[PDB]
Design a protein around this motif. Structure first.
Motif, PDB file in Angstrom:
ATOM      1  N   UNK A 105     162.761  52.761 101.913  1.00  0.00           N
ATOM      2  CA  UNK A 105     161.613  53.321 102.621  1.00  0.00           C
ATOM      3  C   UNK A 105     161.086  54.597 101.971  1.00  0.00           C
ATOM      4  N   UNK A 106     161.894  55.650 101.931  1.00  0.00           N
ATOM      5  CA  UNK A 106     161.456  56.939 101.415  1.00  0.00           C
ATOM      6  C   UNK A 106     161.959  57.144  99.990  1.00  0.00           C
ATOM      7  N   UNK A 107     161.308  58.074  99.286  1.00  0.00           N
ATOM      8  CA  UNK A 107     161.678  58.347  97.904  1.00  0.00           C
ATOM      9  C   UNK A 107     163.116  58.802  97.744  1.00  0.00           C
ATOM     10  N   UNK A 259     152.888  53.750  96.283  1.00  0.00           N
ATOM     11  CA  UNK A 259     153.307  52.371  96.466  1.00  0.00           C
ATOM     12  C   UNK A 259     152.758  51.803  97.764  1.00  0.00           C
ATOM     13  N   UNK A 260     152.386  52.665  98.717  1.00  0.00           N
ATOM     14  CA  UNK A 260     151.769  52.212  99.954  1.00  0.00           C
ATOM     15  C   UNK A 260     150.354  52.720 100.171  1.00  0.00           C
ATOM     16  N   UNK A 265     155.919  54.171 104.675  1.00  0.00           N
ATOM     17  CA  UNK A 265     156.965  54.628 103.749  1.00  0.00           C
ATOM     18  C   UNK A 265     157.641  53.468 103.033  1.00  0.00           C
ATOM     19  N   UNK A 266     157.253  53.219 101.784  1.00  0.00           N
ATOM     20  CA  UNK A 266     157.867  52.188 100.955  1.00  0.00           C
ATOM     21  C   UNK A 266     158.274  52.810  99.627  1.00  0.00           C
ATOM     22  N   UNK A 267     159.541  52.638  99.261  1.00  0.00           N
ATOM     23  CA  UNK A 267     160.037  53.000  97.944  1.00  0.00           C
ATOM     24  C   UNK A 267     160.733  51.796  97.320  1.00  0.00           C
ATOM     25  N   UNK A 296     153.612  43.808 102.634  1.00  0.00           N
ATOM     26  CA  UNK A 296     152.189  43.487 102.558  1.00  0.00           C
ATOM     27  C   UNK A 296     151.392  44.698 102.085  1.00  0.00           C
ATOM     28  N   UNK A 297     151.648  45.854 102.709  1.00  0.00           N
ATOM     29  CA  UNK A 297     150.973  47.091 102.319  1.00  0.00           C
ATOM     30  C   UNK A 297     151.186  47.387 100.839  1.00  0.00           C
TER      31      UNK A 297
END
Ligand SMILES: Cc1ncc(COP(=O)(O)O)c(CNCCCC(=O)O)c1O
Length: 404
Positions: A105-107, A259-260, A265-267, A296-297
């Motif tokens: 999710x997060x970096x 990335x989003x 929150x995508x990592x 999807x995002x």
């Protein structure tokens, strides 16, 4: 009546943690390169949520992907499969040409994942005895706020009062190949993790050949090269990865933020099978990691960056921006540095005149920027900005600087 800006400030101060002291501006809307506060005032965004909105605020395609998926399915957890995750994984791993991706999710989670991968690979592939694996970092690094992340930091505000600290994290100076060689003499070193450009340190651009050096030094000593491109990746610096400027293929690639497009929150952690497959089922994961909505995002955000050719835009406009910033008087702006649309200026700070005051007046003239310490101001607008807009924002930066 709706809350005023001062109302917003007091409310957060009353019921929220004081872990930030943000620039006094209370936004309620954002679109493309622009932000709007509760008073209706218009601002240029020159921070881009630390590159998270490289595509601009609320880019329509990514909004559409989010909206379409949110009605279908948002979270199955990883106990079961969802239909989107494999699609996203195939797309992103063929885009960057690695065998596999581990979604987080997060970096900071991508960084933690990279560290766990490094240690597992060291113990199980390199033969390092448990538990003597070391990871080397560069001074001035920033990759999160977990205890591990701050244990690699040389910034007192990250680590002071939060120890004891993670063992096995060695620190060497940034942009220093001889120090890296010396450090890589230890056979128990599993990985070197480094930012191609140090963002939060103040846009520190290392010297030409540093990245290629690092690749060679990691390869020669059987050490994994982890490139944290969470801020520098995804078109921000004028390439898809900052490491592309030197044609360097890291062993592990960290992705987040853009990335989003700021929507979720995508990592991502990218690497080949010989590294990724050291982690077996049940040994690592995340509740929300790889959920279908974020996937999807992410597919949409990456498509946006490719289709609108935001990397080339960032390169050309960063050339222009740095050129105009160099024309500022050397007695007030001591330096301008960066790549693509990741840039900063260093001002001749005084007791009474600092980067914070400059950012306040920039805000007053409709441009939002972030000061690092007392002397560094970042300039990083969304990559969708046009030349005509970039000029005019430059005209605000001028006028503001020469007003003092
Ligand atoms: C290069 C690089 N890698 C990794 C990270 C960690 O990303 P997280 O999502 O904040 O955990 C960062 C964190 N960026 C932080 C600014 C936002 C804030 O602190 O409020 C970074 O800069």
């Amino acid at each position: 009546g709706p809350p005023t800006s001062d109302d917003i400030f007091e409310r957060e101060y009353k019921y929220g943690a004081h872990n930030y002291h943000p620039l006094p501006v209370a936004l309620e809307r954002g679109k493309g390169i622009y932000l709007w506060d509760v008073e209706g005032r218009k601002y240029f965004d020159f921070l881009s949520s630390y590159s998270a909105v490289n595509q601009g605020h609320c880019h329509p395609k990514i909004v559409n992907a989010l909206k379409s998926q949110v009605d279908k399915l948002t979270l199955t957890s990883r106990a079961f499969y969802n239909n989107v995750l494999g699609e996203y994984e195939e797309y992103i791993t063929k885009l960057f040409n690695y065998h596999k991706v581990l979604p987080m999710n997060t970096g900071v989670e991508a960084g933690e994942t990279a560290c766990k991968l490094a240690r597992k690979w060291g113990y199980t592939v390199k033969g390092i005895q448990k538990y003597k694996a070391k990871i080397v970092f560069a001074a001035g690094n920033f990759w999160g706020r977990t205890l591990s992340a701050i244990s690699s930091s040389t910034d007192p505000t990250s680590y002071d009062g939060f120890g004891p600290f993670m063992p096995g994290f060695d620190i060497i100076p940034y942009n220093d190949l001889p120090a890296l060689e010396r450090a890589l003499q230890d056979p128990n070193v599993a990985a070197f993790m480094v930012e191609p450009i140090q963002g939060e340190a103040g846009v520190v651009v290392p010297d030409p050949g540093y990245l290629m050096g690092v690749r060679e030094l990691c390869t020669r000593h059987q050490v994994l090269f982890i490139a944290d491109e969470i801020q520098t990746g995804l078109a921000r610096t004028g390439r898809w990865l900052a490491v592309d400027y030197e044609n360097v293929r890291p062993d592990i690639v960290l992705l987040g933020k853009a990335l989003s497009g700021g929507l979720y929150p995508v990592s991502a952690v990218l690497c080949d099978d010989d590294i990724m497959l050291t982690i077996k089922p049940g040994e690592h994961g995340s509740t929300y990691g790889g959920n279908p909505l974020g996937c999807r995002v992410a597919i949409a955000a990456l498509e946006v960056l490719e289709e609108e050719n935001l990397a080339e835009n960032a390169d050309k406009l960063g050339i222009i921006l740095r050129n105009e910033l160099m024309k500022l008087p050397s007695d007030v702006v001591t330096a301008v540095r960066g790549k693509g649309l990741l840039n900063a200026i260093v001002i001749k700070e005084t007791k009474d005149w600092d980067a914070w005051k400059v950012c306040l007046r920039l805000r007053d003239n409709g441009l939002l920027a972030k000061p690092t310490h007392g002397d560094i101001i970042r300039f990083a607008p969304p990559l969708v900005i046009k030349e005509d807009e970039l000029r005019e924002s430059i005209e605000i930066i001028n006028k503001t600087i020469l007003s003092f």
